[PDB]
From a paper:
The essential and metabolic enzyme adenylate kinase (AK) undergoes large-scale conformational changes in response to binding of its substrates ATP and AMP. In addition to the well-characterized ATP- and AMP-binding domains (ATPlid and AMPbd, respectively), the enzyme has three functional loop segments including the p-loop, the selectivity loop, and the catalytic loop. Here, based on a comparative structure–function analysis of AK enzymes from E. coli and the archaea Odinarchaeota and from human AK1, we found that conformational changes in the enzymes are to a varying degree linked to bending, fraying, or unfolding/folding events of the termini of α-helices observed in various structural hot spots of the enzymes.
In the closed state, however, the side chain of Lys47 shifts rotamer and forms an electrostatic interaction with the side chain of Glu44 located at the N-terminus of the helix. The crystallographic structure of the AKeco Lys47Ala variant in complex with the inhibitor Ap5A was determined to 1.8 Å resolution. As expected, this AKeco variant adopts a structure nearly identical to the native structure and has the ATPlid and AMPbd subdomains in the closed conformation. Structural comparison of the K47-helix in the Lys47Ala variant and in the native Ap5A-bound structure shows that there are no major changes to the helical structure. The observed local helical distortion caused by the side chain of Gln48 binding to the main chain nitrogen atom of Gly45 is further maintained in the Lys47Ala structure. From a functional perspective, the Lys47Ala variant displays a significant increase in k cat relative to the wild type (1.3-fold increase from 360 to 464 s–1), while K M values for the substrates ATP and AMP remain unchanged. The T m of the Lys47Ala variant in apo and Ap5A-bound states decreased with 3.4 and 3.0 °C, respectively, relative to the determined melting points for wild-type AKeco. These differences are significant, and the roughly equal degree of destabilization of the open and closed states indicates that the open-to-closed equilibrium is not affected in the Lys47Ala variant relative to that in the wild type. However, the local destabilization of the K47-helix resulting from the Lys to Ala replacement does correlate with an increased k cat value as observed for the Lys47Ala variant. On the other hand, the Lys47Ala replacement led to a less stable protein with a more dynamic K47-helix and increased catalytic activity.
Residue numbers in the entry: 1 to 214
Write the structure that this text describes.
């Protein structure tokens, strides 16, 4: 099974990706996690993304296309994979089509703009896994600690209100057009397309997604 998740910043994609990976046994390919890991380790491929991400802007198409082509060439992707944050522009989507990469489901998370800031300013993350929490809406079992490993959670440097506002403007200009792109692909028989109400509680969104995916 191959899946793409679409939606605005803070819509809940990373939260739901963890449940899909577990139930269907496929790896997640998260371009944001890969870029943040490259910055932390100083990797030649991606470490220069630091200043762009902290400004709330998208990194270049060529850099993230190379990161994804390297990741999915690997062996855990022979049974499928889940794309979370890629594609982010029409040229990234066209690059996947031209490479012959087709998917089975495109899942859109619908969330009103007015909810995004307060979701992101309360976000706390376990950087080694990509797992995510919220101090008010979805907290860990022990404050400040990852549920699965118990290790200390951190706050992302780009998760302040003014950066989030810039990311949303960028989303509307560059990324929202992918809803139409994959709606058109689904009408041609090339994938299934479905939308979920991302304002429901975490456990209900999970249940709605399981009904779609079977
Ligand atoms: N392909 C690409 N091309 C170019 N540049 C790229 C790129 N990919 C990455 N980049 C670069 O990386 C930067 C950051 O990108 P990115 O890493 O993708 O971060 P983002 O834009 O800020 O938004 P997310 O996708 O991380 O949010 P989400 O939909 O996953 O929701 P979440 O589960 O976290 O949940 C949000 C919060 O709400 C909480 N929450 C989740 N679900 C619910 C719920 N149902 N009810 C209440 N609260 C909830 C969560 O606990 C959490 O605290 C970009 O600006 C760009 O520079
Ligand atoms: Na397909």
């Amino acid at each position: 099974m191959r899946i793409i998740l679409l939606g605005a910043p803070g819509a809940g994609k990373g939260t739901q990706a963890q449940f899909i990976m577990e139930k269907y046994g496929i790896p997640q390919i998260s371009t944001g996690d890969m870029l943040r890991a490259a910055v932390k380790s100083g990797s030649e491929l991606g470490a220069q993304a630091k200043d762009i991400m902290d400004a709330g802007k998208l990194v270049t198409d060529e850099l993230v296309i190379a990161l994804v082509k390297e990741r999915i060439a690997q062996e855990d992707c022979r049974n499928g994979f889940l794309l979370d944050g890629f594609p982010r522009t029409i040229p990234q989507a066209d690059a996947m089509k031209e490479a012959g990469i087709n998917v089975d489901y495109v899942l859109e998370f619908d969330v009103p703009d007015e909810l995004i800031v307060d979701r992101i300013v309360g976000r706390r993350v376990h950087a080694p896994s990509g797992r995510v929490y919220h101090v008010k809406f979805n907290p860990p079992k022990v404050e400040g600690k990852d549920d699965v490993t118990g290790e200390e959670l951190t706050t992302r440097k780009d998760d302040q209100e003014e950066t989030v506002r810039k990311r949303l403007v960028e989303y509307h200009q560059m990324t929202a057009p992918l809803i139409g792109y994959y709606s058109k692909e689904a009408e041609a028989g090339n994938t299934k397309y479905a939308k979920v109400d991302g304002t429901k509680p975490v456990a209900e969104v999970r249940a709605d997604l399981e009904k779609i995916l079977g």
